[PDB]
């Protein structure tokens, strides 16, 4: 179970990196909504990670 949580935690960390890259890409794209979603996503993952 600990390994599974770590994998999930690792996935969240991996997701955060991917999401951050997308946000940077979104800024280049000029779409405000895509950038906004990334910011919201970053906050929940960090909270989940801290709890985890």
């Amino acid at each position: 179970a600990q390994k599974r949580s770590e994998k999930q935690y690792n996935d969240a960390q991996n997701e955060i990196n991917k999401w951050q890259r997308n946000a940077q890409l979104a800024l280049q794209k000029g779409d405000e909504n895509l950038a906004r979603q990334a910011l919201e996503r970053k906050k929940t993952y960090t909270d989940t990670s801290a709890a985890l």
């Binding site: 946000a23 940077q24 979104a26 800024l27 000029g30 950038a35 906004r36 910011l39 906050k43």
Partner: peptide, 12 residues
């Protein structure tokens, strides 16, 4: 505040 930070990130 996060949105403002995002806007700053977007300009470069």
């Amino acid at each position: 505040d996060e949105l403002a930070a995002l806007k700053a990130q977007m300009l470069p």
